[PDB]
Amino acid sequence: AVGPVADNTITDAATSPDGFSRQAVVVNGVTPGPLVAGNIGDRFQLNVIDNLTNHTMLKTTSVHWHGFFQQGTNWADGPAFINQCPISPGHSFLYDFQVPNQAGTFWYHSHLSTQYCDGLRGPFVVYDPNDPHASRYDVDNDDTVITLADWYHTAAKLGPRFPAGADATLINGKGRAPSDTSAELSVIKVTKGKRYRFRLVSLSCDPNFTFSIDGHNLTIIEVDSSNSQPLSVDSIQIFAAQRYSFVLNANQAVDNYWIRANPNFGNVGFNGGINSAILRYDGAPAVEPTTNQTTSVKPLNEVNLHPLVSTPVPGSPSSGGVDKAINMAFNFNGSNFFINGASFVPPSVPVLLQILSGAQTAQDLLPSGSVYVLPSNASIEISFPATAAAPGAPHPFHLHGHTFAVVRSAGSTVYNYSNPIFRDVVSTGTPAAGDNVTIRFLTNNPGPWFLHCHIDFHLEGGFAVVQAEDVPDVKATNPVPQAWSDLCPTYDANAPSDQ
Ligand SMILES: *[C@@H]1O[C@H](CO)[C@@H](O[C@@H]2O[C@H](CO)[C@@H](O[C@@H]3O[C@H](CO)[C@@H](O)[C@H](O)[C@@H]3O)[C@H](O)[C@H]2NC(C)=O)[C@H](O)[C@H]1NC(C)=O
Ligand SMILES: *[C@@H]1O[C@H](CO)[C@@H](O[C@@H]2O[C@H](CO)[C@@H](O)[C@H](O)[C@H]2NC(C)=O)[C@H](O)[C@H]1NC(C)=O
Ligand SMILES: [Cu+2]
Ligand SMILES: [Cu+2]
Ligand SMILES: [Cu+2]
Ligand SMILES: [Cu+2]
């Protein structure tokens, strides 16, 4: 919709996506924010204009472009105090980056504190004119993007540290809460006889969602920006920050069908049309579906997903057969999460700025014990053993700057070194199953890259580490614009009540 070159204006505004009015952070007047789009090869120049006025939801901001490698533009990645200081209120900041080697479904969100939960999140699509899946569908446009979100009546800083589920699930920005069971539902329109590439984007800040459409099956063709072989499913459990493209054939009777996105906790089920939207065939009356849900008999399993094209797994086909193996031991003490004994606290000098200032070893980099220095041009294996020591499972972990092979998925004891799916957000499963979700990637991208749980409340409690990749080359590889250099002095000159 907007972009590749566009202004994104950030403001606080009253919204009522479920009929309950509340102040939120909005992008060009709306939450979820508008669709940002371009084509593979494009240069994006997204001018983020911070016109925020509300300290409780943060007057400063920083935007992450989720799933993009940002090779040579690490300064544009978004995480506050990792890749930049926040943009200050009354200022604007230009994110200027290219997407030469990626296409698919992405999203964008605040990467400052828990601000994205308050509304600053939207979908982001990069189209491929030669899409290898093009023959599988007829329609792929603004109207085929489906966003899912958790929505809270109380602002992120004002409610419990770890909320017990959302008030409403939003599908394309609308949904029902208990407080109003007649609130307007989203309608997704289809013309009978056409095949649609639906790009399902989880903008969720906590809960995962089990997504299904009554009377319709789905063909998964994309997994977080990576093209997959066509997998036929009748439901999709989608974790916070994940994306899927699925093909829906609009081949059923002209009618209204329930679209369902059932959260893992909170207000579960569908009483009064909560957790729901409407699939309306052209010509069907403007009423609610009366369709019934059927048991999922072909649910998505991550182990069933494989890349469309042969994609080699980094390293060699054996446990720890990589250049560097890292294990992440989780802890939690009631308020903070710890990875290998360290709870992440953002440094005063952003990690990138520290590196540009000469800090190139784990010893010199802050915060102490949260930064992992990675050798260049190397295969890396990271395991995330599920433990009851860290409540809140299943934790979806996200690695910035990279896609990774999921060598072992949640619910599986298999190590797949041949043809596992590659993605950027992975469920780390549950301790009950003794899960030990393990990933692999190559260090082809100099810069500090965040690695964290994407449940934003957990990130906020410190559930994060930094992967500092090829530190001696970072400065040369990612030359920084004057505006970026100006962010920290400006931010540090703010009255704390204007932050
Ligand atoms: C800054 O943004 C915050 C967070 O969105 C706003 O906080 C809001 O603060 C008011 C209290 O002034 C809360 O009002 C309570 O509202 C409920 C629901 O309507 C009502 O039943 C209570 O009697 C009471 O009025 C409100 O819940 C809270 N908002 C959220 C989303 O947590 C604050 O108002 C904003 N500042 C400005 C100047 O707009
Ligand atoms: C979606 O996929 C499911 C699962 O394959 C299909 O369910 C089969 O449906 C036929 C015809 O109604 C029955 O004979 C079988 O018993 C069903 N199999 C199972 C395991 O449930 C369903 O038909 C598909 N729906 C559409 C609209 O294509
Ligand atoms: Cu993200
Ligand atoms: Cu990301
Ligand atoms: Cu988590
Ligand atoms: Cu992140």
Coordinates of C-alpha atoms and ligand atoms in Angstrom, one line a residue:
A1 CA 0.0 0.0 0.0
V2 CA 2.5 2.6 1.1
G3 CA 6.2 2.6 0.1
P4 CA 8.9 1.7 -0.8
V5 CA 9.5 5.4 -0.3
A6 CA 7.0 6.9 2.2
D7 CA 6.4 8.9 5.4
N8 CA 5.3 6.8 8.3
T9 CA 3.7 9.3 10.8
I10 CA 3.6 8.0 14.4
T11 CA 1.0 9.6 16.8
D12 CA -1.2 8.7 19.8
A13 CA -4.9 8.4 19.0
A14 CA -8.2 7.0 20.3
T15 CA -9.1 3.7 18.5
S16 CA -11.9 1.2 19.1
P17 CA -11.1 -2.0 17.2
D18 CA -13.4 -4.0 19.4
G19 CA -15.8 -1.2 20.3
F20 CA -13.9 -0.2 23.5
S21 CA -12.2 3.2 23.0
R22 CA -8.6 3.5 24.2
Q23 CA -5.5 5.6 23.4
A24 CA -3.1 3.7 21.3
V25 CA 0.1 4.3 19.2
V26 CA -1.0 4.5 15.5
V27 CA 0.8 4.7 12.1
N28 CA -0.6 7.1 9.6
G29 CA -3.7 7.4 11.9
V30 CA -4.4 3.6 12.2
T31 CA -3.6 0.5 14.2
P32 CA -2.5 -2.0 12.9
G33 CA -0.4 0.3 10.7
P34 CA -0.9 0.4 7.0
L35 CA 0.6 -2.2 4.6
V36 CA 4.2 -1.2 3.6
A37 CA 5.1 -2.9 0.3
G38 CA 7.7 -3.1 -2.5
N39 CA 9.4 -5.5 -4.9
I40 CA 12.6 -7.6 -4.5
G41 CA 15.6 -5.4 -5.4
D42 CA 13.9 -2.2 -4.1
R43 CA 15.5 0.5 -2.0
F44 CA 13.1 1.4 0.9
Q45 CA 13.3 4.9 2.3
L46 CA 10.8 4.9 5.1
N47 CA 10.8 8.2 6.8
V48 CA 9.5 7.7 10.4
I49 CA 8.0 10.9 11.8
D50 CA 7.7 10.8 15.6
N51 CA 4.7 13.0 16.6
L52 CA 4.1 11.1 19.8
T53 CA 2.9 13.1 22.9
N54 CA 2.1 10.4 25.5
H55 CA 4.9 9.4 27.9
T56 CA 3.0 6.4 29.2
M57 CA 3.2 4.7 25.8
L58 CA 6.5 6.3 25.1
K59 CA 7.1 9.6 23.2
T60 CA 10.3 8.1 21.6
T61 CA 10.2 5.3 19.1
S62 CA 12.3 2.9 17.0
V63 CA 11.0 0.7 14.2
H64 CA 12.2 -2.8 13.3
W65 CA 11.6 -4.3 9.8
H66 CA 11.0 -7.9 10.8
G67 CA 12.8 -10.5 8.7
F68 CA 15.0 -8.4 6.6
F69 CA 18.8 -9.2 6.5
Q70 CA 19.8 -5.5 6.5
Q71 CA 23.3 -6.4 5.2
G72 CA 25.4 -3.2 5.4
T73 CA 22.5 -1.3 7.0
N74 CA 22.6 -2.7 10.5
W75 CA 22.0 0.8 11.8
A76 CA 18.5 0.6 10.3
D77 CA 17.5 -2.7 12.0
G78 CA 15.5 -1.1 14.8
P79 CA 16.2 -2.6 18.2
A80 CA 16.6 0.3 20.7
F81 CA 20.1 0.4 22.3
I82 CA 21.2 -2.4 20.0
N83 CA 21.1 -0.8 16.6
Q84 CA 20.2 2.8 17.4
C85 CA 19.0 5.2 20.1
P86 CA 15.3 5.8 19.8
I87 CA 13.9 8.6 17.6
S88 CA 12.8 11.5 19.8
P89 CA 9.4 13.2 19.7
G90 CA 9.2 16.1 17.3
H91 CA 11.9 14.5 15.2
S92 CA 11.9 12.2 12.1
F93 CA 14.4 9.5 11.0
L94 CA 14.9 8.0 7.6
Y95 CA 15.3 4.2 7.5
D96 CA 17.1 3.7 4.2
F97 CA 17.8 0.1 3.2
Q98 CA 17.7 -2.4 0.3
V99 CA 16.1 -5.8 -0.1
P100 CA 18.2 -7.2 -2.9
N101 CA 17.9 -10.9 -2.1
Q102 CA 14.6 -11.5 -0.3
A103 CA 10.9 -11.6 -1.1
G104 CA 7.8 -12.6 0.9
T105 CA 5.8 -11.7 3.9
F106 CA 7.3 -9.5 6.7
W107 CA 6.1 -6.9 9.2
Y108 CA 7.2 -3.8 11.0
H109 CA 6.9 -2.8 14.6
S110 CA 8.3 -0.6 17.4
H111 CA 11.3 -2.2 18.9
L112 CA 11.4 0.0 21.9
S113 CA 10.1 -1.5 25.2
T114 CA 6.6 -2.9 24.9
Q115 CA 5.4 -0.1 22.6
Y116 CA 4.4 -2.4 19.7
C117 CA 1.7 -3.9 22.0
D118 CA 0.2 -0.4 22.3
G119 CA -0.4 -0.4 18.5
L120 CA 2.8 0.3 16.6
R121 CA 2.8 -2.7 14.2
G122 CA 1.8 -3.4 10.6
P123 CA 2.3 -5.8 7.8
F124 CA 5.1 -5.5 5.2
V125 CA 5.2 -7.4 1.9
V126 CA 8.0 -7.7 -0.7
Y127 CA 6.6 -9.0 -4.0
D128 CA 8.5 -11.2 -6.4
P129 CA 7.7 -10.6 -10.1
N130 CA 9.0 -14.1 -10.9
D131 CA 7.4 -15.7 -7.8
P132 CA 8.0 -19.5 -8.2
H133 CA 4.5 -20.0 -6.6
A134 CA 2.7 -17.7 -9.1
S135 CA 1.0 -20.6 -10.9
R136 CA -0.8 -21.6 -7.7
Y137 CA -3.0 -18.5 -7.3
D138 CA -4.8 -15.7 -9.1
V139 CA -5.0 -12.9 -6.6
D140 CA -2.3 -11.4 -4.4
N141 CA -2.8 -7.8 -3.2
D142 CA -3.7 -5.5 -0.3
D143 CA -6.9 -7.4 0.4
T144 CA -5.1 -10.8 0.8
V145 CA -3.1 -9.7 3.8
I146 CA -4.5 -11.1 7.0
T147 CA -3.1 -9.7 10.2
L148 CA -3.6 -11.2 13.7
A149 CA -3.1 -9.3 16.9
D150 CA -3.7 -9.4 20.6
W151 CA -5.6 -6.4 21.9
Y152 CA -5.6 -5.1 25.5
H153 CA -8.0 -2.6 27.1
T154 CA -5.2 -1.5 29.5
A155 CA -2.0 -0.1 28.1
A156 CA 1.3 -2.1 28.2
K157 CA 2.8 0.0 31.0
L158 CA -0.4 0.1 33.1
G159 CA -1.5 -3.5 33.3
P160 CA 0.1 -6.6 34.8
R161 CA 3.8 -7.2 33.9
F162 CA 2.7 -10.4 32.2
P163 CA -1.0 -10.2 31.1
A164 CA -3.1 -13.4 31.2
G165 CA -4.2 -13.1 27.6
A166 CA -5.7 -10.3 25.5
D167 CA -9.2 -8.7 25.8
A168 CA -9.8 -9.3 22.1
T169 CA -8.1 -11.1 19.2
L170 CA -8.1 -8.8 16.2
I171 CA -8.2 -10.1 12.6
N172 CA -7.5 -7.3 10.1
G173 CA -7.7 -4.8 13.0
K174 CA -11.2 -5.8 14.2
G175 CA -12.5 -8.3 16.8
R176 CA -14.9 -8.8 19.7
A177 CA -14.3 -8.6 23.4
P178 CA -16.8 -9.8 26.1
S179 CA -17.8 -6.1 26.6
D180 CA -19.5 -5.9 23.2
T181 CA -20.6 -8.9 21.2
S182 CA -22.0 -6.8 18.4
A183 CA -18.8 -5.0 17.5
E184 CA -18.0 -4.9 13.8
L185 CA -16.1 -7.9 12.5
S186 CA -13.6 -7.8 9.7
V187 CA -14.8 -9.1 6.4
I188 CA -12.4 -10.7 3.9
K189 CA -14.0 -10.8 0.4
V190 CA -13.5 -13.5 -2.2
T191 CA -14.9 -14.0 -5.7
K192 CA -15.9 -17.7 -6.2
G193 CA -13.7 -19.5 -8.7
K194 CA -10.5 -17.5 -7.9
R195 CA -7.5 -18.8 -5.9
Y196 CA -6.1 -16.3 -3.3
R197 CA -2.6 -16.0 -1.9
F198 CA -3.4 -15.0 1.7
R199 CA -0.4 -13.7 3.6
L200 CA -1.1 -14.4 7.3
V201 CA 0.9 -12.2 9.6
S202 CA 1.1 -12.5 13.4
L203 CA 1.5 -9.0 14.9
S204 CA 0.9 -10.6 18.3
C205 CA 2.7 -9.4 21.5
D206 CA 2.1 -12.6 23.5
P207 CA -0.3 -15.4 22.6
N208 CA -0.1 -17.7 19.6
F209 CA -3.2 -18.4 17.5
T210 CA -4.7 -21.5 15.9
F211 CA -6.0 -20.2 12.6
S212 CA -8.7 -21.9 10.5
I213 CA -11.4 -21.1 8.0
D214 CA -14.7 -23.1 8.0
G215 CA -15.2 -25.4 5.1
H216 CA -11.9 -24.5 3.4
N217 CA -8.4 -26.1 3.4
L218 CA -5.2 -24.2 2.9
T219 CA -2.1 -24.7 1.0
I220 CA 1.0 -23.3 2.7
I221 CA 3.5 -22.0 0.2
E222 CA 5.6 -19.6 2.4
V223 CA 7.0 -19.8 5.9
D224 CA 8.3 -16.5 7.4
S225 CA 9.6 -15.2 4.0
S226 CA 11.0 -18.6 2.9
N227 CA 9.2 -20.4 -0.1
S228 CA 8.1 -23.8 1.0
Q229 CA 6.9 -26.8 -1.0
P230 CA 3.0 -26.8 -1.1
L231 CA 1.7 -28.2 2.2
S232 CA -2.1 -28.9 2.5
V233 CA -3.4 -28.1 6.0
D234 CA -6.7 -27.4 7.6
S235 CA -5.4 -25.3 10.5
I236 CA -2.3 -23.3 11.3
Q237 CA -0.9 -22.7 14.8
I238 CA 0.9 -19.4 14.3
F239 CA 3.3 -18.0 17.0
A240 CA 4.0 -14.3 17.7
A241 CA 5.9 -12.6 14.8
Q242 CA 5.6 -15.6 12.4
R243 CA 4.2 -15.4 8.9
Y244 CA 2.6 -17.9 6.4
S245 CA 1.3 -17.5 2.9
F246 CA -1.5 -20.0 2.1
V247 CA -3.5 -20.5 -1.0
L248 CA -7.3 -20.6 -0.5
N249 CA -9.4 -21.7 -3.5
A250 CA -12.7 -20.0 -3.3
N251 CA -14.5 -23.0 -4.6
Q252 CA -17.3 -23.5 -2.0
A253 CA -20.9 -22.3 -2.2
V254 CA -21.4 -18.5 -2.3
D255 CA -21.8 -18.0 1.4
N256 CA -20.4 -16.6 4.7
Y257 CA -17.7 -18.7 6.4
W258 CA -16.2 -18.2 9.9
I259 CA -12.5 -17.2 9.9
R260 CA -11.1 -18.4 13.3
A261 CA -8.0 -17.4 15.3
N262 CA -8.1 -19.1 18.6
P263 CA -5.6 -17.9 21.2
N264 CA -3.7 -20.3 23.5
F265 CA -4.9 -18.4 26.6
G266 CA -7.2 -15.6 27.5
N267 CA -10.7 -15.6 26.1
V268 CA -10.6 -18.8 24.1
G269 CA -13.3 -20.2 21.8
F270 CA -15.9 -18.3 19.8
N271 CA -18.8 -17.4 22.1
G272 CA -20.4 -14.3 20.6
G273 CA -18.1 -14.3 17.6
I274 CA -14.9 -13.5 19.6
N275 CA -11.6 -14.7 17.9
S276 CA -13.4 -14.4 14.6
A277 CA -13.8 -12.7 11.2
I278 CA -15.9 -13.3 8.1
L279 CA -15.0 -14.9 4.8
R280 CA -17.7 -13.5 2.5
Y281 CA -18.1 -14.7 -1.0
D282 CA -19.2 -12.0 -3.5
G283 CA -23.0 -12.0 -3.6
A284 CA -23.5 -13.5 -0.1
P285 CA -25.8 -11.4 2.2
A286 CA -24.1 -9.0 4.6
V287 CA -24.7 -11.2 7.7
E288 CA -22.6 -13.4 10.1
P289 CA -21.6 -16.9 9.2
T290 CA -23.6 -19.7 10.7
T291 CA -20.9 -22.3 9.7
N292 CA -19.7 -24.9 12.2
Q293 CA -16.1 -25.6 13.0
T294 CA -14.8 -29.1 12.1
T295 CA -12.1 -30.9 13.9
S296 CA -8.7 -30.2 12.3
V297 CA -7.6 -33.4 10.7
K298 CA -4.5 -32.0 8.8
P299 CA -3.0 -29.5 11.2
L300 CA 0.3 -27.8 10.3
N301 CA 3.4 -29.5 11.7
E302 CA 6.6 -27.6 11.3
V303 CA 8.5 -30.9 10.5
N304 CA 6.3 -31.3 7.5
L305 CA 7.5 -28.0 6.0
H306 CA 10.4 -28.1 3.6
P307 CA 12.0 -25.3 1.4
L308 CA 10.6 -25.1 -2.2
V309 CA 14.2 -25.2 -3.5
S310 CA 17.1 -27.3 -2.2
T311 CA 18.6 -25.3 0.6
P312 CA 21.8 -26.7 2.3
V313 CA 21.9 -26.8 6.1
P314 CA 25.0 -25.0 7.5
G315 CA 27.7 -27.3 8.9
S316 CA 27.8 -31.1 8.8
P317 CA 25.1 -33.7 9.6
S318 CA 25.9 -34.3 13.3
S319 CA 25.2 -32.9 16.7
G320 CA 27.6 -29.9 17.2
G321 CA 29.0 -30.4 13.6
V322 CA 29.3 -26.6 13.2
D323 CA 32.1 -24.0 13.7
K324 CA 30.5 -22.7 16.9
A325 CA 27.8 -24.3 19.1
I326 CA 25.8 -22.2 21.7
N327 CA 23.4 -23.5 24.3
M328 CA 20.9 -21.1 25.9
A329 CA 20.1 -21.9 29.5
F330 CA 16.9 -20.2 30.6
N331 CA 16.0 -18.9 34.1
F332 CA 13.2 -16.7 35.5
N333 CA 12.7 -15.2 38.9
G334 CA 9.2 -13.8 38.9
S335 CA 10.0 -10.4 37.1
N336 CA 13.0 -11.1 34.9
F337 CA 14.2 -13.7 32.5
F338 CA 17.9 -14.8 32.2
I339 CA 19.8 -16.4 29.4
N340 CA 22.9 -18.2 30.7
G341 CA 22.8 -16.2 33.9
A342 CA 22.2 -12.8 32.4
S343 CA 19.0 -10.8 32.2
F344 CA 19.3 -8.3 29.3
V345 CA 19.4 -4.6 30.3
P346 CA 19.7 -2.2 27.4
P347 CA 23.1 -0.4 27.4
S348 CA 23.2 3.4 27.5
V349 CA 25.4 3.4 24.4
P350 CA 23.8 1.3 21.7
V351 CA 25.7 -1.9 20.9
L352 CA 26.4 -0.8 17.3
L353 CA 27.7 2.6 18.5
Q354 CA 29.9 0.8 21.0
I355 CA 31.4 -1.2 18.1
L356 CA 31.8 1.8 15.9
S357 CA 33.6 3.3 18.9
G358 CA 36.1 0.3 18.9
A359 CA 34.4 -2.3 21.2
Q360 CA 35.0 -5.6 19.3
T361 CA 35.3 -8.3 22.0
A362 CA 32.7 -9.7 24.4
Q363 CA 34.9 -8.4 27.2
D364 CA 34.6 -4.8 25.9
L365 CA 31.0 -4.9 24.8
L366 CA 28.0 -3.9 27.1
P367 CA 26.0 -5.3 28.7
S368 CA 28.5 -7.7 30.2
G369 CA 27.5 -11.3 29.6
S370 CA 24.7 -10.7 27.1
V371 CA 26.9 -10.2 24.0
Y372 CA 28.2 -13.2 22.1
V373 CA 30.9 -12.6 19.5
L374 CA 30.6 -14.8 16.4
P375 CA 33.4 -15.7 13.9
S376 CA 32.9 -14.6 10.4
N377 CA 31.9 -17.0 7.5
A378 CA 31.1 -19.7 10.0
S379 CA 28.3 -22.2 10.7
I380 CA 26.5 -21.6 14.0
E381 CA 24.3 -23.9 16.0
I382 CA 22.0 -22.7 18.8
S383 CA 19.9 -24.9 21.1
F384 CA 17.1 -23.5 23.3
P385 CA 16.3 -26.4 25.7
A386 CA 12.8 -25.9 27.1
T387 CA 12.7 -25.7 30.9
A388 CA 10.1 -25.2 33.5
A389 CA 12.6 -22.7 35.0
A390 CA 11.3 -20.3 32.4
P391 CA 7.5 -20.0 32.6
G392 CA 5.5 -18.8 29.5
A393 CA 6.1 -21.7 27.0
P394 CA 6.0 -22.1 24.2
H395 CA 8.5 -19.2 23.7
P396 CA 8.9 -18.1 20.1
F397 CA 12.5 -17.0 19.7
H398 CA 13.6 -14.6 16.9
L399 CA 17.0 -14.1 15.4
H400 CA 17.7 -10.7 13.6
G401 CA 19.8 -10.4 10.5
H402 CA 19.3 -14.0 9.4
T403 CA 17.1 -16.9 8.4
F404 CA 18.0 -20.2 10.1
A405 CA 17.4 -23.9 9.5
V406 CA 15.1 -25.5 12.1
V407 CA 17.1 -28.7 12.5
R408 CA 14.9 -29.8 15.4
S409 CA 11.4 -28.5 15.9
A410 CA 9.1 -28.4 19.0
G411 CA 7.3 -31.7 19.5
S412 CA 10.0 -33.6 17.6
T413 CA 13.1 -35.6 18.6
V414 CA 14.3 -35.7 15.0
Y415 CA 17.4 -33.7 13.8
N416 CA 16.9 -32.9 10.2
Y417 CA 20.1 -32.0 8.5
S418 CA 18.9 -32.6 5.0
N419 CA 15.9 -30.5 4.1
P420 CA 14.4 -28.7 7.2
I421 CA 12.5 -25.5 6.8
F422 CA 14.3 -22.2 7.2
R423 CA 12.6 -19.3 9.0
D424 CA 13.2 -16.4 11.4
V425 CA 10.9 -17.1 14.4
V426 CA 10.7 -20.5 16.0
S427 CA 8.6 -22.0 18.8
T428 CA 11.0 -23.5 21.4
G429 CA 8.2 -25.9 22.5
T430 CA 7.5 -27.1 26.1
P431 CA 9.5 -28.7 28.9
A432 CA 6.8 -31.4 29.2
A433 CA 7.9 -32.8 25.9
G434 CA 11.6 -32.4 26.8
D435 CA 11.9 -30.1 23.7
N436 CA 15.3 -28.9 22.6
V437 CA 14.6 -26.7 19.6
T438 CA 17.8 -26.2 17.7
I439 CA 18.7 -23.9 14.9
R440 CA 21.6 -23.3 12.4
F441 CA 22.8 -20.3 10.4
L442 CA 25.9 -19.0 8.6
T443 CA 27.6 -15.8 9.7
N444 CA 27.4 -13.9 6.5
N445 CA 26.3 -10.5 7.9
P446 CA 28.5 -8.3 10.0
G447 CA 26.8 -6.4 12.8
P448 CA 25.1 -6.9 16.2
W449 CA 21.9 -8.8 15.9
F450 CA 19.3 -9.3 18.6
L451 CA 18.3 -12.8 19.6
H452 CA 15.3 -12.9 21.9
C453 CA 11.9 -14.2 22.8
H454 CA 9.3 -12.4 20.7
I455 CA 6.7 -12.4 23.5
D456 CA 7.2 -8.7 24.0
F457 CA 6.5 -8.8 27.8
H458 CA 9.3 -11.4 28.1
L459 CA 11.7 -9.4 26.0
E460 CA 10.9 -6.5 28.4
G461 CA 11.9 -8.7 31.3
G462 CA 15.3 -9.3 29.7
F463 CA 14.8 -12.5 27.7
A464 CA 17.4 -11.5 25.1
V465 CA 21.1 -11.7 24.0
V466 CA 23.1 -10.0 21.3
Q467 CA 24.9 -11.9 18.6
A468 CA 27.8 -9.7 17.6
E469 CA 28.9 -11.0 14.2
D470 CA 32.2 -10.2 12.5
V471 CA 33.0 -7.2 14.8
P472 CA 36.2 -6.1 13.1
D473 CA 34.3 -5.5 9.8
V474 CA 31.1 -4.0 11.2
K475 CA 32.2 -0.3 10.8
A476 CA 33.4 -0.7 7.2
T477 CA 30.4 -2.8 6.1
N478 CA 27.7 -0.6 7.7
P479 CA 28.6 3.0 7.0
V480 CA 26.2 5.2 9.1
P481 CA 24.3 8.3 7.9
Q482 CA 24.6 11.6 9.8
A483 CA 20.9 11.3 11.0
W484 CA 21.8 8.0 12.8
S485 CA 24.9 9.6 14.4
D486 CA 22.5 12.3 15.7
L487 CA 20.0 10.0 17.3
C488 CA 21.9 9.4 20.6
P489 CA 22.8 12.9 21.4
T490 CA 19.2 14.0 20.7
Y491 CA 17.7 11.1 22.7
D492 CA 20.1 11.6 25.7
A493 CA 19.3 15.4 25.7
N494 CA 15.6 14.6 26.4
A495 CA 13.9 15.3 29.7
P496 CA 13.1 11.7 31.0
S497 CA 9.4 12.6 30.9
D498 CA 9.7 13.2 27.1
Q499 CA 11.1 9.7 26.5
Ligands
LIG1 C1 -1.6 8.2 27.8 O1 -1.8 6.8 27.3 C2 -2.3 6.1 28.4 C3 -2.4 4.6 28.1 O2 -3.2 4.4 26.9 C4 -3.7 6.6 28.9 O3 -3.9 5.9 30.1 C5 -5.3 5.9 30.4 O4 -5.4 6.5 31.6 C6 -6.8 6.7 32.0 C7 -6.8 7.3 33.4 O5 -6.5 8.7 33.1 C8 -7.4 5.3 32.2 O6 -8.8 5.6 32.3 C9 -9.7 4.5 33.1 O7 -10.4 4.2 31.9 C10 -11.2 3.1 32.1 C11 -11.8 2.6 30.7 O8 -12.4 3.6 30.0 C12 -12.4 3.6 32.9 O9 -13.3 2.6 33.1 C13 -11.8 4.1 34.3 O10 -12.8 4.7 35.0 C14 -10.7 5.2 34.0 O11 -11.2 6.3 33.4 C15 -7.2 4.4 30.9 O12 -7.6 3.0 31.3 C16 -5.8 4.4 30.5 N1 -5.7 3.8 29.2 C17 -5.2 2.5 28.9 C18 -5.3 2.1 27.5 O13 -4.7 1.8 29.8 C19 -3.7 8.1 29.2 O14 -5.0 8.6 29.2 C20 -3.0 8.8 28.0 N2 -2.9 10.3 28.2 C21 -3.6 11.1 27.5 C22 -3.3 12.6 27.7 O15 -4.4 10.8 26.6
LIG2 C1 -10.2 -30.5 3.1 O1 -9.3 -31.5 3.4 C2 -9.9 -32.5 4.2 C3 -8.9 -33.6 4.7 O2 -8.4 -34.3 3.6 C4 -11.0 -33.1 3.4 O3 -11.7 -34.0 4.2 C5 -12.1 -35.7 3.3 O4 -13.3 -35.2 2.7 C6 -13.9 -36.3 2.0 C7 -15.1 -35.7 1.2 O5 -16.0 -34.9 2.0 C8 -14.3 -37.4 2.9 O6 -14.5 -38.6 2.2 C9 -13.1 -37.8 3.9 O7 -13.5 -38.6 4.9 C10 -12.4 -36.6 4.4 N1 -11.1 -37.0 5.1 C11 -10.8 -36.7 6.3 C12 -9.6 -37.4 6.9 O8 -11.5 -35.9 7.1 C13 -12.1 -32.1 2.9 O9 -12.9 -32.7 1.9 C14 -11.3 -30.9 2.3 N2 -12.3 -29.8 2.1 C15 -12.4 -29.2 0.9 C16 -13.5 -28.2 0.8 O10 -11.6 -29.4 0.0
CU3 CU 9.7 -8.7 15.2
CU4 CU 13.3 -9.2 13.5
CU5 CU 9.1 -15.8 26.1
CU6 CU 13.6 -8.2 17.8

